[PDB]
Symmetry: none
Subunit: 242 residues, 2 copies
């Protein structure tokens, strides 16, 4: 066999190093990939290795630890991601996906769903809704265990209330907060199993979305280790003025 | 706070959402540290590291100032990158612990700049080292590096395991610091942040810098440390 390999995926992070190297993380159908393009800023590879580009790369893994990029070819771009609102949601999906899947957990199915999330944010009228739908859908492919059929505390069937401690759901007896409204509940109960096409057709109104983002944040942070810096990108206000 | 209602602007450095849904925050502002609660509608959810404008009410019956309005003034999206987030978190904890009414307009501007640097520069670890020492300068604290910490002899070159300053060759038990480390310890507090940015200490020598800072702050500064847990 050989120490050089062809890989293909989407750039989710780009670091320009003090030496002018470019360190990228990619999501690919064969897993997460970190690699360095040496003297990359000042040569032919700089523009291709940018956020959200689908690139083909030839990488070399030395015998003894970061893979080095020998060639890079742009396979796919979404120019509309330069629109600030779309960029923001693409960026959320990128950091969220990286946070959600630990090393080895990132499958081909996850790659395909991730790529579709970027297409959706790039092309659809309501990119926040794409990101809500896709982020919940990715829970089904990862190491967390979604559980909406029983109260997270006592086990009672069909809980309808927020779970501030674990980010699941509580029954009316275990809960100190009012029930989620019906469209929120319906989303929470079915978002993992429902096709993304089906979910895109049933958007939850904007007023009910903070509840959805909050539940997602609590659940992921309780279930998955890490810093969950991706929460910096969850919708949290519109900037004032320039 | 020297009135009941007030308009304030700063950066959220700590954020907790209570089981009841209340957001409790600490802000650094040009007029000092401000702790506040948003009960439960607001224009901004007061996210960590965001620069926000708030209107707060504080009367004689409230423990914490109560947030009545909040708008986002600006955000640094690249703080979403785990490594940059970690250094921003370090800076936040640092300034919380370091500034006991001590926190001034200039400290605010330096703090904000530390976040921008962490967000935007290729070497966030370096931004954090430089900014931490710089902030010591604007606080009560100040490493005396001009003189041996034990006997007072001028221009000490050796580690100070007990206090994180510097010892002279006659009081010291350890070999002298490398020249680049020494140069930084002597001048980091007064050098402009830009000049320090142009002279990064190599990474092999940085653990000696973190160890001195941490020792000096422990000895000189009140409150234990959440901050210490995040030092590299
Ligand atoms: Zn129950
Ligand atoms: Zn001495």
């Amino acid at each position: 066999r050989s120490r050089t390999a062809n890989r293909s995926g989407i750039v989710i992070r780009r670091r320009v190093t003090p030496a002018g190297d470019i360190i990228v993380t990619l999501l690919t159908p064969q897993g997460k990939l970190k690699a360095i393009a040496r003297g990359g800023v000042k040569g032919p590879l700089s523009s291709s290795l940018n956020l959200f580009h689908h690139v083909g790369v030839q990488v070399y893994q030395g015998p003894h630890d970061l893979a080095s990029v020998k060639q890079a070819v742009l396979e796919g771009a979404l120019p509309t991601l330069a629109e600030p609102e779309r960029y923001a949601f693409a960026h959320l999906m990128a950091e969220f996906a990286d946070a959600l899947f630990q090393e080895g957990e990132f499958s081909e199915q996850a790659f395909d769903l991730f790529a579709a999330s970027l297409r959706g944010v790039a092309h659809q009228p309501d990119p926040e809704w794409v990101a809500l739908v896709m982020s919940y859908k990715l829970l089904g492919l990862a190491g967390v265990i979604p559980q909406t059929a029983r109260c997270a505390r006592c086990g009672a069937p069909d809980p309808e209330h927020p779970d501030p401690l674990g980010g699941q759901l509580l029954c009316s007896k275990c809960a100190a907060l009012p029930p989620y409204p019906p469209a929120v509940l319906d989303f929470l109960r079915h978002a993992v199993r429902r096709t993304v096409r089906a979910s895109f057709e049933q958007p939850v109104p904007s007023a009910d979305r903070p509840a959805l983002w909050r539940a997602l944040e609590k659940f992921v942070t309780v279930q998955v280790g890490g810093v969950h810096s991706w929460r910096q990108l969850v919708p949290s206000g519109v900037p004032v003025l320039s």
